[PDB]
RNA sequence: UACCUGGUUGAUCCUGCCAGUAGCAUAUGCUUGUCUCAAAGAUUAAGCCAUGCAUGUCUAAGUACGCACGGCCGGUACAGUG
């Protein structure tokens, strides 16, 4: 299941301004950023040993 | 600039100190137009202190769900400034 979709946002409401609803930033996530930052220290490990 | 002068005697020559003489540091008195640099609560009390200030700090890169903001797009987890 995508955590993505079960992200309780915020129901902001205030006078003239347009509705808002905000949703917090899902931190211990494994993004394509995560992956490639264990990918270059494993990279590291190679250099170092050749 | 490697310097002396007055004072003991009726007069003399000495010993010897007193006073004079020049700088330099603190205080003080009188006087003071221009211009440059410039010390400054050490001395006595390392005594006592009203009040204000003298130490804070964010980048692309630790943590942003403050609508605090003008503004995107609307199922977008997080647009940005903060």
């Not at 979709?5 to 905000?22: A, F, I, M, S």
């Amino acid at each position: 299941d995508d955590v993505r979709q079960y992200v309780v946002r915020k129901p902001l409401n205030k006078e003239g301004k347009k509705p808002r609803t905000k949703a917090p930033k899902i931190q211990r996530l494994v993004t394509p950023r995560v992956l490639q930052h264990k990918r270059r220290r494993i990279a590291l490990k190679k250099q170092r040993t050749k």
